[PDB]
Symmetry: C3
Subunit: 643 residues, 3 copies
Amino acid sequence: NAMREIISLNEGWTLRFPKGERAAETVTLPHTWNAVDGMDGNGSYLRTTGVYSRTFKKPVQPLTGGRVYVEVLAAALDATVKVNGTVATTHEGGFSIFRADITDLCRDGDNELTIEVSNEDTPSMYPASADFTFYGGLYRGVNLISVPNAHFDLDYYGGPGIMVTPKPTADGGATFEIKSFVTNPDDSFTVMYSIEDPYGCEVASAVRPSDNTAISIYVPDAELWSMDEPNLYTVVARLQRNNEAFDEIYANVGVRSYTVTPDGGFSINGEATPLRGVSRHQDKLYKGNALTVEDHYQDAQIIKELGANTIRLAHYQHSQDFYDACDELGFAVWAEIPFISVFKSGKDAHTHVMEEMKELIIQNYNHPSILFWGISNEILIGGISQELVDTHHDLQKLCKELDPTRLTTIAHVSHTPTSGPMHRITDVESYNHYFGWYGGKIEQNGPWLDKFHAENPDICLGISEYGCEGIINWHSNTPQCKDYSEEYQALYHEYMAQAFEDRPWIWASHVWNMFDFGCAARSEGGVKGRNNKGLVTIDRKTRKDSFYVYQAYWAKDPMVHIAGRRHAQRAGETTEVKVYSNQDTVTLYCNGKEVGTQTAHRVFKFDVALDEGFNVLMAVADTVKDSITLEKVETEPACYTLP
Amino acid sequence: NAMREIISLNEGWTLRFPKGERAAETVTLPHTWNAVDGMDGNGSYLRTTGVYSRTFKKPVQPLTGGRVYVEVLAAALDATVKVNGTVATTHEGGFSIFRADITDLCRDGDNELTIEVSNEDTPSMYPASADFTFYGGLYRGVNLISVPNAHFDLDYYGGPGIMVTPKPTADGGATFEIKSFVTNPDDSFTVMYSIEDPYGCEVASAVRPSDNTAISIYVPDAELWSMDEPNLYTVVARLQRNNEAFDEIYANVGVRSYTVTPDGGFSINGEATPLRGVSRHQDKLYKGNALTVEDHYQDAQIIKELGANTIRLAHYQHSQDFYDACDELGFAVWAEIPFISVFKSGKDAHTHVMEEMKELIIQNYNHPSILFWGISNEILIGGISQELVDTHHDLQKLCKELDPTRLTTIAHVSHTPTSGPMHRITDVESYNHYFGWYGGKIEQNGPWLDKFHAENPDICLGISEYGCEGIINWHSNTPQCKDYSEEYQALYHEYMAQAFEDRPWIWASHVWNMFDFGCAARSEGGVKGRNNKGLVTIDRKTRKDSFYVYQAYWAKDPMVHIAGRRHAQRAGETTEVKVYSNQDTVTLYCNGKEVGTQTAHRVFKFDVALDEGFNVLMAVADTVKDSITLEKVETEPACYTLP
Amino acid sequence: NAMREIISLNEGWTLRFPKGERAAETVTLPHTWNAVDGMDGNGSYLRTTGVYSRTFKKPVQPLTGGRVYVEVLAAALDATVKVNGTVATTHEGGFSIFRADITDLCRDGDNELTIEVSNEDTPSMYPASADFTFYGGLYRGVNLISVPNAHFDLDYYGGPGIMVTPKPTADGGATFEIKSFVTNPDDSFTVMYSIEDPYGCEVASAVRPSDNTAISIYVPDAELWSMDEPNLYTVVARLQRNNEAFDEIYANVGVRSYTVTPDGGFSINGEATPLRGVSRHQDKLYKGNALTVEDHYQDAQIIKELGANTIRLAHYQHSQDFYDACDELGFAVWAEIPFISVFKSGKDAHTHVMEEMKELIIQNYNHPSILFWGISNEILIGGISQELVDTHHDLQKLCKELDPTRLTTIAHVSHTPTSGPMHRITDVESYNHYFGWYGGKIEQNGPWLDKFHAENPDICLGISEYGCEGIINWHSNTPQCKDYSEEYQALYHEYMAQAFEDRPWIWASHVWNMFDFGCAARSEGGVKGRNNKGLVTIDRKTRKDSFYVYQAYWAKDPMVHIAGRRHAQRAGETTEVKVYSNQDTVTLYCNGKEVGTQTAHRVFKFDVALDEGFNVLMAVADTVKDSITLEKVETEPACYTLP
Ligand SMILES: Cc1cc2nc3c(=O)[nH]c(=O)nc-3n(C[C@H](O)[C@H](O)[C@H](O)COP(=O)(O)O)c2cc1C
Ligand SMILES: Cc1cc2nc3c(=O)[nH]c(=O)nc-3n(C[C@H](O)[C@H](O)[C@H](O)COP(=O)(O)O)c2cc1C
Ligand SMILES: Cc1cc2nc3c(=O)[nH]c(=O)nc-3n(C[C@H](O)[C@H](O)[C@H](O)COP(=O)(O)O)c2cc1C
């Protein structure tokens, strides 16, 4: 990128543990020391200080005055960077980029880079109390940046050096208000802005002095961004002297406007579009949170095939890779900070939360997929206080100071009083409800929504979490709460899918959660270490039957799915064979004999007298078919039921 | 794949020779120490004991109970594997996968793997008497396999741990009878089966207990497999515990039925499809048999262009890569064991042949291209025995016990009595005939076939070997047996191609051989160390005129080939210019003047009066043209005739 | 390629300087020690002796007789190759391939290779007096070549070992006159020639004795080569023995014929096609001339988008990568030797130019893009002598002995007398003019051309250099010579582009230059170390407004460009907004308000009264649009004018 050089420093590390809990080991980044114990259900996970260290050569610039920066893409939870013995920087918060100018700590030839990382609790730390593992370490990798003396800003909250506000115009075009930030500007430097259309062709440009960089650029005939058509432009910014580019940065951006109203729900680009989707944690089976770029895009593609149009990226800042995948595949994204569960008093905990929100907005400001900033999750679990409420006003004020182009949101714990000072702080609001799993009946969800909506017709209500555990080796002919069966989780989501389709004024609903994820503290349903409320398993391999409920309710590609394939052995004179489809007519066959034809909306239930022995079940929708094999048995195996 | 990990161990080996024939060398697998002396004509090839050794790091499973296996893809001919000095396993037979569980012999960190390979004869060994170099060493590569304690079986005759039997159903679907094999099954483990269509979409599924894994899965509207349309399905098997896959394995398979009848020949999926093809050895110029996956696919592609629809994979188990290429590209494959030439009596020789066949079947059961198991080649060269006959009955019974879905076959040496105990053992039978090369006249082939067919109307007769040496620096105007010319080899195959077209009741015919191959004992026709009966040279570069004979008879894409280009200088008032085409009318031009137009079936002979000096011969078929240059000389060069 | 094995030796080098100007450094090829100081404007560049040194392993051939060559792709400007301390060869000339047979200097295992390179002047050296940096070192890389004892010639002038002369025939075909050159030919070796068509299919073949290889091969229905449709054939040659390829070389070639007449200009394949294009140097920003293959193709792609159909590759032999890029992308290439500015008298200098010319023709004879051999550039700067004129006639004779199929050309310095001995030597002739930049006025160019053509109606007149410096931080409301402004360089090329469009009898015009390039001696217009006459900056990143003039005049894809975006702040009651387009009607809008509509040929000038503040200038052509932002100011910045 012009004279800017980015060198990956992911290889060649030794991880030591000063308190001796593990022998030294050589590792490659991305890395966490909790990749296994953070989700194997041993009972705990190692929280402590791990020291990473490696050697690097000092990068060299052709021209005098070069500068060297180390870029950590995340250090969970607390970090100190040393070059050749001397502290270069410290950082708190384990989900955001931070950088350090290590120019003057560098010598020619080999240098030593030392990063102390701690995932231990501290008086100012968030997260501290949550239902998910705090994987320690350098789980996103580390970069070396070489730039000339004049270069776009690398020092401001790990930001990109450029902010872009695209807006549609009445005449069918778009304005891109752009500002970039130059370290050591000077009258001999300009900033040349160029905008490239989705196909790579330049469509607009403008030029500014390097010390006065704000400009608004107009693109005619703009291709708007939406979840269905995520059209992207590329803003390129070049720091120029004479006929030479010194620095170059760029940003993918999208043009969209959007509204949420209490009676109307969500609209984007003037079209009513109810947000129906999922939440997603950042871990994977025995990798901890140390995911590759392929991991992130694979998650995104699975969620796209589901037919979701929104993703709540709880409970922290995610990878640039996953925001990139959202911009490109088209999802409405809710991004949030880990201000979770239990308010911690003090100036330092207040400073942590504000800094983390400042980094979340500045590092992710250019992503068109991000529509909502979330300021807390379930913060009343630890009890309300005046101090806690003031922090939420401070955070609301910061989001509108930093970014008035986006809506603020909040996720309430289930028992949050439906009046009180926690409402009307943010532009929109959501509740985390588990009626039918942690308490109550499934049939309570609908009336709860209707009642709150009627009593608060000025609040935009969404559901930021709802869900139910499903452990796919348990299977019940009489599925009920706390049997943990795949069938009961499907019944829960059968109701909710239809509940949210009945209520477009719910601006967004988010299944908790897309995937099973790791929580060291969990033990229930015969499994340790896990939240198993996923529509898909933690290794991304197995779609539960709940997944196909949503696929039939959301996806447009024709599909037909026979539920209960893992209920392989069925006892009884008849058994219910359930089919999900986005077609409206399903014919079921059993060993070639027609069982029946039904016309229904999404869910189809057939009573089937299985033949003795093995049975081919074939469901014929319109252009799609499905087929599974079931076995009639006298008594179903002991292993289909929790001990 | 789930928690299964396969690591390539092809790098960083040291090859030593205990008896001192060579200095120690560092090698990379695939490797044979006979890559040069096995085909360079020096006189002999080194048969001895080579010792390979390298270090490897112990792989780590995230959960407790991890197991480690070493996988040797092939070791020619006899091997002993040691880990840290201790013997892990021994294996006899040089063409098939074997594995050892080395868990208890591994320590943390670096381990030492040592493999002692011998290609010397033993009282047990097959091959022992054949016309091809027994290249020695680790010529397919080595893998390391990490698996959890519960995993698909790794210990059974080097197999994949799954067997899949697809059959077409009457209503246009397919049943897949699947059985998988689990080491340490358990009530908490299930096997989840999934079937993907050629385009990667799931079309059917079933689930089973891990100690009772057999299931039949029906796929509607199945896409059938044939040599013209090799549609493949993927069967995936996952070992599942709760919401987590422990192990995963998979098999590409095709849906086809087929028949051979003595009068009707070969049918596949209901259509009479005479099998007309070639054999193929597994070596390549100065590589020995240490071929890469690209080499195998290159061979497959060259055979596909030839228009061949069957490949005889003589005389041993070939690479998985090549069976994969036959499944993907579509060839009817005859697969066989090296039970060749001279029968060795003794219980140990018996065990060898029985186990090599068992490995052949279990390691290749899932390939749809394999249609025929061949139990022996030319086994009466060493005289018939009652032990010999009984071993053939044992192999026939073994083949039908392990795999009733395929047909057995045998290749008789030319002088085998057409009556007697070697007939009616296998389902179909072939002969190796060389009338017109090893004696006899070309014109006896046709009558011989018709006499056998007329006398043994209950036998399905094929021709597994026929061919003729062709060395392309020798050229003759009066081509005759033993001048070794390219022209005589073409005349031989001109006749044979037409003979097999006339006889659809020959179930299969295989040219010996597709490529020149290495045999260290050969010395004839002015060349040492080669069998030069190939249609294509041993470096895969030059197609002989014999190749284009078969292309014209077999290939569907229009082509046209002027023969005799390497007969560059022609003497005589007229010279014959021969053209091969799969179009039916050829106009020949000589320096732009029209020489003749003919309508013929495949073969076109023109008598041409060449102008003095150089002549442009252009042949014009319907939509294609060919062009070569010839020179008119007074005396042809001495270098065109064997000395 | 058969038994030929090409190994790159670009890694693992140490570079020392005997005279101690620098410390020892390890380097990778391609490399030059003048990568930075040759274009940073410090004042000078290091011309000394650098000694590169690495160790390599002797390659092994499977048969006795193996040979080892070292191939240096270029060494600027003088080199000596040693293997294990023994001189293998010496070379003069910094831009052509040279090889050494090092078979006998080699021992088994590790050997040491030393290459002393010096870029200082010598009595025989060209280049010596020129406006570009003589970057020193191994700026194209080094190869090791292993061949059998019989192989295609590696010892004749760095040549490819084969020459191919394709010519179209009247019946729509093509003849390929082929000669290859075999070292240690022999009666058992034949050369087998094959011609593959653009799509990889063999269309023609011939075979020859290896002591007598010349042959003409006819291809029917030939696909012609042209700049618009650069169809390429592949000629393949194989050294064959028995059934085994010993060596293999190949060449990509194209079929074209072309003419130049004084009154008709240039024609290719019978269609008049004026050559309008650019020159190109081989350096890039702080890379010196150590360019990668991507750098070469990137330059070619940029020139293709510009719409040029001709590239003058001054002032030396360029890399094979770029000649390939011109063969593949389609440009008429003028290639030349660095016989520039000042004639050196004496026999060694004369030998230098004759040998460098010979290397140019032999190494590039097969490239269909090359149409013109250039013998000298501006050679009368140092005065005419009898000996200069003689050396020019020697070069003409050498060109027509080596290559009668191409046209010779020459580049005259501006003041070269329009009569006399420097004219009518070569087939065509060019002048380097800079009327309007080094003197005179822009409007003199047109009349000059018309006077020469009137006076010399038998000379084919081209313009091999013209241009004007443009430094893009300088902007002027009254552009004039020596303000160095982007606007004035644009005015220049606006006139010149229309000048050559008006004169199709100019056979070729070449803009000096396509890119800015490095000249250590230069210091002017506020920039040091640079010739800044490029249409595009030296880092390939920024197209000057001059670039879009030529794009409008040459390119076919619709485009529209508002000039002067870097004149970003504009003073005056009105400002001129200039637009370039290859559409003929442009509507300009200022902040949504129409300013005017014009129908012009390529260049559009609008007088705009800007609004106070920021202004959106949008230009609407037929199917394309352009948009830029301008600011109205009272006083334009100080930094738009040279101090
Ligand atoms: C999205 C966004 C990105 C920003 N990036 C930068 C930046 O990279 N560099 C910078 O100096 N200021 C940046 N700013 C602006 C600063 O917030 C503000 O102008 C001023 O520097 C106050 O800095 P403070 O937050 O340290 O008080 C950015 C502002 C926003 C909203
Ligand atoms: C194609 C094929 C693959 C087989 N793979 C296995 C296997 O992986 N593990 C196993 O225990 N049996 C496997 N079997 C079946 C065995 O033959 C079976 O265990 C048999 O009853 C035991 O006989 P044996 O142990 O003497 O071979 C396979 C059978 C076939 C036909
Ligand atoms: C394009 C071209 C390539 C040539 N390549 C070779 C070659 O590789 N080897 C060779 O012996 N001659 C080659 N020649 C021809 C030589 O000029 C020829 O051998 C000549 O008689 C040698 O003369 P010399 O030894 O005085 O240079 C080539 C000629 C041309 C025009």
